[model samples]
Target chain A: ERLSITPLGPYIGAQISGADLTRPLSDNQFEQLYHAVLRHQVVFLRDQAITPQQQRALAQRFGELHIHPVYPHAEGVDEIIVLDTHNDNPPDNDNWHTDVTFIETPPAGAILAAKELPSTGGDTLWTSGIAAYEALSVPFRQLLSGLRAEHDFRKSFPEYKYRKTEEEHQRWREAVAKNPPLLHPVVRTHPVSGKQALFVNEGFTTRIVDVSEKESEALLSFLFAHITKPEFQVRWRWQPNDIAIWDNRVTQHYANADYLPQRRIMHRATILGDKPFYRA
Target chain B: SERLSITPLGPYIGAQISGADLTRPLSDNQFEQLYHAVLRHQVVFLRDQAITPQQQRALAQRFGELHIHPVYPHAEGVDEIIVLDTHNDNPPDNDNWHTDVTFIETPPAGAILAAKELPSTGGDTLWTSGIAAYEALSVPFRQLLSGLRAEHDFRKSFPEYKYRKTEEEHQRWREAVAKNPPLLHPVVRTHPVSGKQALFVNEGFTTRIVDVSEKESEALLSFLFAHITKPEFQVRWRWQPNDIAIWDNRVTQHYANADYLPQRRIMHRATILGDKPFYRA
Candidate 1:
C-alpha cells in the first residue's frame, strides 16, 4: 500500500494515510513519518488499533517518556496517561494553551489517540508556532527572537501555587516541587529542524523578560491575541480510534472542554526533549 | 467636574467620556485628555454635546485640519459640516467596514460624528481597531504585506453610475470625481501620533492589492476584511441624539448599520485631515 500525506491547511497540519500503527513499521517508514511530523508540524492517522505497550513504544522512538504528576495514568505502564471525563476531574482546558510549557525541558511531542466517544463535540486545535513567529514583520520579529519569557506551572496547572489551606499544603508543596518555574527563549529553535517557534502560550507563559512591566504586558497580549486568529491553525474534530501525534516543540494546542455530562476518554504518550534556545 | 468620566464600551475600542462640556471651549488639559482617550480607545463618545455646527468644526480643527465634503450637503451656513438625513429608501452606504475617503491622498486623521436625530431602536454603529487587527495577524502574514500597497477608488463606495441615475445627478457626481482621484496608501499604515502600525486597507474604498495577481489580491483582501471584523476587536455604539463619536481614522474602521429602515435618522460629521499614509518597514 502507498502512503499519502494530505495538508490540512496552507499553514499547519497534515493527515497521513495507509500505514497501520498497530504493527511495527520498517526503518524507512518510521523515518518518513518522523520527517512528515516535522514538515507538517502535526500529523494525524485514523483508525489506529494499538495497545498501551504499542503506544509507549511509539513514544520511546522519539525519546524518553514523561509521567505526568497531576493527570491520572494507566496502571503499570506509567508512561501512558489516561484522560477520562466521567470522573470529578473537571477540565480547565477551555482556553488556548500549550502542554507542559512550565518545565525547563517540556515534552518534545505528544501522541493522543481517541478512545471513548462523546457522540458529540470534543475537537482539538493546534497552532503552528513557526507560523506565528513568522507572522510578525521583520522589525518585531527581530525584537522577539532575542527575548526570553517566564513560564510557571502555577500559571496553568497550579493546585498549590495560590494560597491554600493547611490540609492541602503538603500535596501542593510536592506538586510545585515536581514542577518548578522555568525560563526559555520567547522564540525557541527546534532541535531537529533548526527552525524557530514562538514558545509562549496563554496557559503557562506569564511575562516577557527584560522588558518593562507595561511593555511586557502589552507585547505578550499582542502575541497571544495574534495566535488566536485562525490564520495558522488546524482544528481536528476527533473520531474514535483516530490517532494524532503533534510535535509540541513547534506548536501549541487546545482541547475543547465543551464535552461535559457526556463521557469522552483519550490516552496520551509524551516524549521528553532538549532545552529551548535561540542561537542568536 | 474633576475630569472627563470615562466608561469603556469594550476591552479595546469605544468609550464614553463624560463629566465634560462640549458647549464650552475645552481647556488645554481637558482637550489633551480627550485626545489621549481617542488614542487609547480608538473612539470616544460624548453625550449631550448640543453644540452648534460652528462649534463642531472648531472642536474638530483642534486635532487636525478640517475637511469640506465634496458630495454630501452641509449644515446651513456650515460647509465643513456634512449633514446625513435618511427616512426610508436612501441608499445604505455606511454598512461596510471602511476608513472614510481613503481614495484621497490625505484621508481624514479623524471624523467626529454627532447624532442629530435617531431611530428609537436601531442605528448602532460598529468600529473595529485596525491596530488590534494588525496585531491579530501572524508575523509571516505581516511580513508578506509589509511591502504591499493598495488602490482605493472613490467610485467603489460612491459610484456615479449607482448614485447618480439622472443626467443632473450624473454631472454632480462627475464634478465631485474631477476634484477627487484614486490614490494609493500602504497596506499597513504607521499611525502618525500613536507610532503604531495599523492594517490600512478597507472593503469599501480599497479596489485591489497592487502587486499581486487579481485572484491573489481578491483572496488576500477578503481574508483581511474578515480578520478586521473579528468580534474581539470590535465595539458597537448605540446612538443617543446629541451624542458625538470621535475616532482615530488611522487606527479604526467603522460601520453604520441601517437596521431601522423607514425610521428617520440624522447625523452630522466633521472630518480632520491627516498626512499621507506610509509605512516605515
Candidate 2:
C-alpha cells in the first residue's frame, strides 16, 4: 500500500487522503497509520467525519483508550471522551499545555476531530520540542539535562463538586496515587526520533526539583519564555472534518480562543503511553 | 448635534465632554449638577485639569470622606489619595476587571481617579454597569442567585500579602482580612442611593458563592461574569493630564488599559467607603 506523509513542523504527519475513516481500515493501512503516528508526532486527515463508534475503532488501533480524568463522557462510550469547548465546563486547556504530564504515564498522543468550525480564527498552534531545547544556551541545556520536575494534578483538576462525586473522588485519589510527584528530566530525548526536546510546559511542570524557590522561578521563567518563541512553532488551520493526532510526549499546544460567540466543538481520544524516563 | 467626540471602547458607554474645565473652583450648583450627571451615567470624566493632591482630595470630599486603598501600601501623609503616575515608576495594579476595595468587609462606595499622564495611543479605561447586568438576567437566574451567599476571601486571591517580610506589614494585612472574611451578600445588590439591583460578583476578590459545590459556583460565576461584561452595559474613559473621572464601586467593573507598552500612564485615586452590600427590599 502506498502512503504519503508531510512534515508539519519537526514532526512528520501524513495527510492520510484517499482513505475513508468511516469504514474499518485494512490491517496494512492501519499499520501504516500507526507508523505515521510515531514518526510525525501528529497526524492530520481532512474532510472525513467519523461517528463515536468509528472514532473508538481508530483509537483502538493505537492502544487501549485511557479515560479522560476530567470532561463528561459520551453516552454508551465512556472510553471516548467528549471535548466540547462551548459546554458549561470551564475550559481545561485554557493555557498553553501538554496533556496530563501530571500523570505517571501521560498519553502517547491525542486524536481530535473538529466537529464545528468557525468562519475564521480557530487555528491551533503546536511548538516544536526539538527546536525549544536546541535554542537554549549550551550551559543551561546541560544544567537542565539531568534535572527533574514535580507535576501536580491539583493544579489542573481541582475538586469541583458539580463535575465529580465523593465516590469518584476516592477512586481518582487511589488511581492517581500510583503517579505521585513523578520526576523526569527537564530535557527529554524522543525515543523514536532520538532528538532532545524541552519537556516542561506551563500546564503541568510547576518547579524544578534541585533548585531554591527563587532560582527555580528565574530558570523556569526563562525556559517558559524560550520554549514558546514564535520561531519554533507551527499553526494548523482547521477545516470541517479535520483530525489532529499530536504526541503528548514531545510537543505542547495552545488553542486560540479567537472565535468567541461562535460555537466550536470537537471530539478527542487519547492513547496511553509508557512511563516517562530521561534519555541520558 | 450630539457630536460628543466619544471613543468606542468595543461598543458600550462613551466618554464625551462639552470641553468642560474642572480646574477652577466649582460652584455648589455646578457640583450638584455634575453629581446628577454622574448618577445618570455611571461614569463621568473631565479633561485637562491640573489639580494638586489637596484639590483632588477636596473634590473627593464633595461626595464623602476619602476611603484609603488597603492594598496600595501608601506612602506617608498621602493615605487618602492613591498616586498613579508613570513617572514615579510605580507598578501597574488596575489591569483587570475588579470592584475597588471589595476585599474589605465594607468596601469603598466610589472612587475619583485623576490621570496625571496620558499616552498618545491606547490608554483608555473601560467600565461596565453592574446594575444593567443584573437587569438583563432572566427572572429564574436572579431568583436562584438571591438565595446564594459567597465566601469572599482576600487571602486566596492575593497570596503575595501572605509572605510579607515585616511583622508590622503582616499585622496590617491580618487586621484587614479579619474585618473582612468570606462575608455573604446577595448576588444581586441594590444600590444604597439609587435603589437599583446591581451584579456584585467580580473576578478579583470573589472566589466562590457558598451553599453550592465548587464546580457549580465556578460555572455560575463564569456565566454571571460574561453577562456582566456585555458591551451594551459598558463605558470607556480616555484620559488627559488632570482629567478627573468618578465611578460608583457599588455598580461597576472597571479595566485599566495596558496597551501602551513602555509608555508611562499614571493616575491618582481617592476612594469613599460604604457599609455592607445590600439589596433594596
Candidate 3:
C-alpha cells in the first residue's frame, strides 16, 4: 500500500497515511510504523476501525502487553484498557504521564484508539522529551544528565480518591503493593535511537534523588513547565476510530479532561519493555 | 469615570490604568500618574486606545526621546514605530525572557506597545518582576550578584544568519553589528526612581558574566533566567485589539507566547531612550 508520512511538529509527531489498522500490518508496513515512532516519538493514523483484540495484536508486534491496574479493560480483552469518562469518572489524564513509569521497567510505548468522541473538545497533546532535553542551556542539561528521580505510583493515585470505597481501596492497595517508588535517570538514553530524553513526568515523578527537597522541587517544576511549552508539543484532535501510537520512553502525554458532561472513551494497549538508563 | 484608576493585576509587575486617553496627549498630572504607576507596577496596560502609529510614537515620546529599532521593520512612513508582525513567514524570536535593547549601553527606559492584530487564541505576553526576583534570593546569593557585570551582545539575539537573507538585509545586519558592539551591564541594577535593585541579565542578549569562569557564568545565568520567571513574580496579559501596554524595561523582563501558528499577530512598539544602568552601593 502507498504510504505518506507527514510531520505534525518540528520534533514530536507525524501522521501516517495509507495503512489500514483493522487488517493486520505486513512486515514492511510494521517496520515503517516502528521507525516512525522511533523518529517522531508519536505517530497518528485516522479511521482505523480495529477491534480490541486487533489493537492488542498490533501492540504485541512491538512488545509484550501490560494490563492497567486501576482502569477497566475492554470486555474479553484484558490488555485493552477502556478509558471511558464522564461526570462520575472524570478524566485524571489531564496531567502529563508516561505509561506505567512508576514501575521498575516502564512500557516502551502504547497504542491508543479513539472509540468515542466529544463534539468539540477532548484533545491529547504529546511533547517530545528529546526536544525539551536538547532545548535547555548546555549547562542545565549537564546538571540533569547526572541526576536521577524517584517516581511513585501513589503520586497519581492519592488516598482520597482510591479509599472512598472498600472495593476501590482493595484494588489500590494491590496496585501499590505491586509497584513501589522507583529511581530512573532524569535524562534517559533511548534504547533504540540512542538519543537522550527528559524522563520525569508530573503525574508520577516525586523528586530528584540527590538534591535537597527544595532544589528538587524547583528543578522538577522548571522541567515540567519547560516540557509543556508549545515548541516541543503536538496537539491531536481525535475523531472516531483515530489511533495514536507513541514511544512512551521518549515522550509524555496529556489527555484533556475538558469534555466532561459529555462522554469520551478510548481503548489503549500498552507495550511493556526494558529498564531506562543514561549513557555518559 | 474612575478618574485615572490603576488596578493591580497581581502582587507584582502589572497594573491596568483606565480613564486616561492615549490617542491625545496626556495632561501634566495624567502623565505624572502614568509615570509613577509604571515605576510602582513595572508594567501598565490600557484597553481600546485606538491609536495611530503617529499617536503611539507621540505617547512614547512623553517619557523620553523615541528609539528607532535597529533591525525590525518599521510601520509604513513612521520610522519610530517598530512593527512586530509575526506569522509563519516571520516566526517569532522573542519567545524567551528578555529586556528590550539591553545590547546597547543605554537601553530603552520603557516601551509603549499597541496591539494591532492578534490570533484567535494563545498569544499572551508574560512579564516578570526583576525586583521580586532579586528580593526573593537569599542574602548571600544577592551579595554575590551585587557587584557582577554581564556581557550583552547584539549577535546573541539578532545573529546574521537569522537576519540576512537578501542584499539589503545583509547590508542592514552589517551596519547594525558595526554600530552596536558588546557592552557590559550590571548583573544587578538599582532603579533610578524606586532605588530598588533588580536582576539585569536576560536570556536574549546577555552572554556571560565578566567576573566568573565560563562554567560559573553559564550556571549562574541559567539559574537567574529560570528564577525571574517564577509564577509569583509574573503577570500574564492576554492581548486585545487596540490595547496598549507600557512597560518599564529596566525592572522587568518579558516573554511572548508563540503558541499560535499559521495565525498572525501584529503589534506596534515605540521605545523611549533610557539612561545607562548603574549598580549603586
Candidate 4:
C-alpha cells in the first residue's frame, strides 16, 4: 500500500497507513512522519513489528533519548522503558501527565508500541494542550500567559509510596536529590511550530509560582480538568503491535487501569527536547 | 458558630455550609436561608450530619414532593429514598454526567443525598454548573442551542438486562418503562428561580436533539456533553462520612467516580420534584 495520512479529528489525532517501522525510513518518508507529528500533535500506526532496538533508533532521529530513573527498562536497551503492569504492581500511571516534565528539559515526544494486551479495556487517551489552551476565555488566557508554575519530581514519586524498601529508598532519595522543584511558564510556546500550548501537568506540577496557595490550586485544578474534555481528546484502543507516536511538548496523556488481574506491557522511547519558554 | 456559614468552593458551583443542624426539621427562617444558598451556589454541602433516612426525606420534602427511583434499590420502608451502594458484585452505572430523572416531564428540582459509607480513598463526586457552561459558549452556539430540544429516555441509563435481576426488579423495570416514555426537553432551560439559562441535556439520559438532523444532533450533543463538564464550571466533592449534599438539579449535572472498586460506598438520595422546564428567548 502507498503512504497515506488520514486525520482522525480536525482537532488533534491522525492515522498513518502504509508505513512500516520494522525497516528504516527513507529521507522523504522520515520527513513526512516528522512533519505529521508537528501538525497532528499525535499519530498512530497499526501492525508495527518493531523491536526495542528499532524503536530506539527511530526515536534517535528526532533527538536524544531519556533513561527513566524509576520505571523498569527493556532488556539490553536502557533507553526503552518497560511498563509491565498487573495486579501485583497495579498501574499508577492512570492519571494525566506529560512525560518527564519534572526535569529541566522534558521530552519533546515519545514513541510507544504495545507488546502485550488484556482481553478487554486498557485504552489510552491523549488531549491536545493547544486546543485546551485556546478554549479558555480571553481574560483567563491572558492571565495564564503571564504566569509560571512549579514542577517537582517528588509529586509523582512520593516518600510514603517509594520508600518502602531499603534499596528502593536509596534510589528514591537519589532521584529526589537530583531533581528539585523548578519553574516553567504556565502557557508555553511550541519550540518548532511557534504556537502556544498549556504546559502545566497533573503528574508533576505542584502550584503556580506567584499566585496564592488557594488561587494556584483553583487555577491548576481547572486547567487539569479542562484538558480532560472530550472535545479535545482522542481515545486509542490498542490492538497487538499497535504503535503511537505523540508530541509530548503540547499534549497530555492518560492510561486506563481498568484491566486488573490481566497484564499489559508496553515499550516506550522518549525523545528529549529543549527547555520550555513563553512567548508573551 | 451559631451563625450559618456558607463558603463557596469553586468559581461557579459548590458551597460548604456549616452551623446548620439537619437532624431535626429547621425553623422557617433557617429553611429560607438554606434555600437561597442552594439557589445561589447550585449545590451546598454540610458535614457531620448524623441524620436518619426519615430525616433526609423530611428535609427534601421541604422543597417539593419526593421521587421514588424507578430502578434503583431504596432504603427499607422508605420508598422515596434511593440507595446507591456500588461495589464489585453490584457494579456502578452512574459514572456519567447526568441530572436525576430527566426522562420525566417535570424532572427534578433538586436532590438531597447523605453519605452513609465511604471507601478509604477515591469515590469523589463532581458537579458542573450548567449556567456556567451555557455562559461560556460562543454567541453563535448559544443562539443555536437556545432554540433546540433534545430527547431523554429512561431506558438509556437502565437497560432491561442490567436492571432485571429478580421478579420484583423485573416488574419495577416493566412498570417504569410503561410510565416513562421518551420525551423532549429544552436543550437550554431557564432556571425557575434564577431565570438563568442552563444546558439541560446530559450524557446519561439525553439521546439526541429532536429538531436537528441526526449528524447535527450528534455533533452538537457531543460538543455540549463535553463542554458542560469543563473544570472551570465544576466542583469536585470528596465525601466524608455523614456528609450531606443538596444540589439544584435544574441547573447542575453530576458524576460519581467509580474509582474505588472492590471497596463499596453507600449513599441515600431524596429527589424533589419541580415544574416543567421552559426556555426564554
Candidate 5:
C-alpha cells in the first residue's frame, strides 16, 4: 500500500515507484497503478526487465488484450506486438495517432517496453489530449461536444504505403474489409477518470461524421493543431529498459524518427476498451 | 560517382542530395539538376563533400558572383570564403532564426555552408521555408503584406555595444557599418529563377516595416516570425564533418543550434551574391 506516484507534469504524466513489474504485484499495487493511470492519464515504470509474457500479463491486469490486425507481431503471442525495426524499415511512428482507433472498440491503453535503442536521438513524446480539450474556449468546447467523428484505419496506415508485397496488399485489403470505419464522440469522456479529451488525432480520425466537407476540414485542422501545443505535451528521453504506459482514451504518443540509420526495437501490449461516449 | 539523387525533406523545403563531389567541377547536367533541386527544396544538404576553399568558391560562383563578409576575415587567397571559427563558442549569436545578410541591397542568392569540424552530438541547424510561411497565412493577410517594405540594418542585428567595448573595437564596427549601410527591401520578394514570392524579413537583420505604425509593425512582424519557423515548414540537419548545406537564401532562413557542450564546431561558407529583390505581383 506504500506506492509513490510523482507527477511528470502539472496534470498529465506520473512516474511510479515501489511497484515492480518483474515481481507479481500485490492487489493493492495493481489497483494503485490502475488509479494512477486514470489520475495522471499516463505513467512511466522504469527498470523493469519483464518477459514478453509478463508484459502481456500486465496489460491483461487492466482489460482484454488488443491484437493488432495490420502490423507484424511475434509468433505465438498474438496480444503483444514486437515492433522490431532495422536500417531497412526504419521506425516511422513519427506521426501522431492513438493506438488502434479505427476499430469499433479501441485500445483502453498500451504499455511500451523499450527493447533496443539507438545511442542517440530516439526519444518519445506524448501529448495530453485532456489538456488540449480543456484549453479550448467554453463555447467552442461545448459546440464540439455534440459532434461525432470518423476514425478510419487507412488514414494513418495506408495500404499503398506499407503494403510492400502483393500478399501484404491483399491481406491489408482483407483487414480493411474486416475493419470498417468507426464513429466516436469528438470529445471522449474517460470511463474511469470521467474527464473529456479530444478524440480526433492526426493518426486515424479523418473527419466529423456529420458536417459539411469544408467545415470538417477546418474544424479538424484546428483541433489537431491545438492538440499539440507545447504546454500540453511531455517528451520522455528513453534509456535502456524503460516502460511507458499511458491511457489511449486521453493521450497521444509519438515515437521520434530522428534516430535514423540506427536500429530501435520496442515491444508493446495494449488493453481493449468499449465504444466511446460523451457523458455531458 | 553517379548523378545526384535529390530526396525531398518535406513537401515544402530542404533536400538531402546524395552523389556528386563538391570538391570537383560538376557536369553541366549535374549543375542543372542541382539548380532544379535548389528551386524545389530551398535548402540542399550534402554530406562528406570534402571541398577546398578554392573549390568552394568555384562551386559558389556557378550559382552567381560570390559575396565577401562585412565582418569575419576571409580564408587565405579566397576573398569570398568566410571561415566561421568556433570552439564550444559562437554561443547565442547563431541561434536565432534568420536570413543570412539581408541588410545589404544585394544579399546573397544563397550560401553553401560546409562544416569543417563537428561535435559528437547536439549541434543541429534548422532551415525553415519562407515560401511556406507566406502561403500558410490567410489570403487577406498575404494581400496586406504584398504592398509593404521593411528596413534592414546590420547595426540593429549585430550591435556595436556587444563587441565595441573599447575604441579599437568601435573603429572596426564603424568601418563595417560604413561599408555596409542599412537598406530597404520588400516584405515579400519574387525569386528571379523560380519566380515565387518569399517573406523576406528575419529576426537577425530586419528592424521594422517602413509603412505601418510602430505598434502594428511589431504586431505583424511577431506573427510573421512565429509563422516562418513552424515545425511543418522546417528541417533540422544534424551536422557531421565535411557535410555542407546549400540554401536558397532568397526563400529560407536558417538557425544554428549551439547546443553542443563546450566542444569545437568550425564551419566555412561561400555566399552567392544575388541581385536586389523585387516583387512583380
Candidate 6:
C-alpha cells in the first residue's frame, strides 16, 4: 500500500495507515518511514501497541540509541527509555526546549509513544523554527545573525551537590564541562530542507555573546516571545498507541502540564545527531 | 512594675499578652516576663502598647542582631526595622506567603512587629504554623523531600529586581548572588528551641522543593501554600494601637491584610538573625 503524506503547515508528515508496530517492520516499510522522517521533519503513526523490544527495533533502524545521562533505564530493556511521567524513569520536558543541547552533539530527533493519557487536556505543542525565523523582521534577523550564546546545566539541576552521589557528580561535571559554551550562529540552516531557523530557546542560550546584556536580554526576550506565538505553533492531541517522531534540531516543544492528579505514560527513543554548524 | 498578662492562645503554641505598655520603659522583670512568654509560645502578641522607634530597636536587640531586608526598600534611619507603613508607602511584599528576608544566605531567625496604626475594619495579620503544615503531608512525600535541595532564585518571582545591565555585569551578579543549594531541612524542620518540625516554605522565596519538576513544584507548592494558610493551623491578630507581634520566622508564615484602604495602617519590624537551616532529626 502507498504511504500517505500530509502537509500540516510548511512541513510534510507521513501518516502510515497500514503498518502495525507490535511486530517488526519489513526493511522497505522502515525505509519509507525513515524517508518520511527526513522529508517532513516529523512523522505520526496511529494505533500500534508496541513492546520494548519492538520499540527498540524501530528506533535502532534509524540510528543508535543514546542512553539518558541522568535518568535510570527500565527494568529489563535499558535501550527503550521510558517516557511515562509516573514511571520510575520519566521524560523531563516541562520547559520550552530542544532536546539534548547540553551534549556536544545533540540528538537528531525523538520518537515518542503514548501509553496512558489523560481523559482531556494532555496535548503537547511544537513550534516550527522555520516558520518562526521566516516571520522575523530584516533588522531582527540581522541582529541575531552575528551572535553566540551560553547554555548551562546549573539551571535545571541546582541540587547537584546534595542530590548527586560523589561518582555521579564527577561524571555529570565531566560530561557538562566538555560541552561548555558551544558557539552556534544565531541562524540555523536545516540540512534537509535548506531553510534558516531560529535556534535558541528559554531553557538554554542564556545570552547572546556579541551584544551587551541589556541589548541581548531585550532582543532574546523579543525572539522568545515571537517564536512561541500561537499562530506559528501546532498542538498534537495524543492517544494511546500513537507515536510522534519529531526532529529536535529544528523544533521547540512544551509539555502542557495543565492536567494534574491524572496519570500519563509514554515511551521515547531519541536518534543521535552530529555536532551542529551555523550558516554564515 | 510593668503590668503584663499572658494567656495561651492554641494547643501546641500561640499566646496573647495584655496589660503591658510598650510606650513606657519597663522594669527588668517586665522584660524578663516578655522573654519568657516568647519562649513558651513560638509566637506571641501584645495589645495596645505603643513605643518609639528606638525602643523597638532596643527590644529586637534582646534576641540578636537585626536582619535588614535587601529588597523591600526601607526608609532612612529605620533600615534595621522594616517599615511596613502601608499608608505612605506601597504595600510591598504583602501579597503572598513568605518568611521575612529569605533571599539571603541566612534569613532572620525571628521578627518583632509593632502595629503603631491600624484600620478599624481590616488590617489584621495572619500566621501559620509551618510545623503543622509539614506534619500533615503524606509520609512518602515527606521522605522524598527530606534531603533534596532547591535553587532559590530571587529573580524568578521578581525579575524587575535583577540589576543586570550588561552581559558581564549580569554574569557578575549571577555569580555574586551565587545559586544557593543550601541544605533545606525536611519539609518539616524541628524548631531548635521547641524541638518540633515546622513547615519551612512560603510563596515569596521558595520556588520549588528541589526533587520535583517545575510542574510538580507548582502543584505541590500551591497545595502546601493553601494548606498552611488554613484557619486551623493559623492565628489572625487584630491590631490595636501599640500592639506588638513577635514570631519565630523559623516556624511561621505571616500575611498582612491589604484589604483596608481608607484607614491608615503602619508598622515597624525588627528581625533576629538565624544561622543556616539544619535538620535535628
Q: lDDT of each prediction vs. the true structure?
A: 0.83, 0.71, 0.89, 0.88, 0.82, 0.69
Per-candidate clash tally:
6, 5, 0, 0, 0, 6
Candidate 5: segments with Cα more than 4 A from true spot: A1-280, B88-92, B165-169
lDDT of 1 at B52: 85
CA lDDT, candidate 6, residue A153: 62
Candidate 6's TM-score on the B chain: 0.82
- For model 1, residues A221-279, the per-residue Cα lDDT tens digits are 77787787798899999998888998998888888878777888899999887788887
Please compute DockQ, using alpha carbons, for every candidate against the native two-chain complex: 0.03, 0.01, 0.02, 0.02, 0.01, 0.02
Between 1 and 4, whose TM-score is larger? 1
Candidate 6: the clashing residue pairs are A213-B167, B130-B198, B130-B199, B131-B198, B131-B199, B189-B197
lDDT (Cα, tens digit) per residue for candidate 4, span B205-256: 9999977655446656777787877799999999999999999999999999
Regions of candidate 6 where Cα sits further than 4 Å from its true position: A1-280, B1-4, B19-33, B71-78, B155-186
**Model 2 over residues B8-114: C-alpha lDDT tens digits?**
33332434444444555567766765665566577777666777667777777888877775555543477798766553344355666778867776777888888
lDDT of 6: 0.69
Give the RMSD in angstroms, all C-alphas superposed, for model 1: 10.2
In lDDT terms, which candidate is top? 3
Better of 4 and 5 by TM-score: 4
Where does candidate 6 chain B have its weakest 10-residue lDDT segment?
B176-185
Residue range B157-239, candidate 5, lDDT tens digits: 67887666668767877888998788899998888888888888898888888776454466557667777778988999998
Q: Show where candidate 3 strays beyond 4 Å.
A: A160-177, B1-281
- For model 6 the TM-score comes to 0.48
DockQ of 5: 0.01
lDDT of 3 by residue, B1-281 (tens): 23598999988779999989998988888998999999999999999899999989988888999888889999998999999999998998899899999999899999999999999988899999999989887554566678788999999999899876788988898899999999999999999888999999999999999776464576577778878878999999999999999999998999999999899999999999999999997
For candidate 5, lDDT tens digit of each residue in A1-280? 5779999889688899887897778998898998998888788888887777888878888889877776666556788898877688888788888877888778888898988888887778888878988876554566577688999978976877857886668877877888798898899998877888888888998888665444466567777777777888878888777888888988888888888788888889988888878898
Task: In candidate 1, list every pair of residues with a backbone clash.
Answer: A134-B139, A134-B140, A135-B138, A135-B139, A135-B140, A136-B139
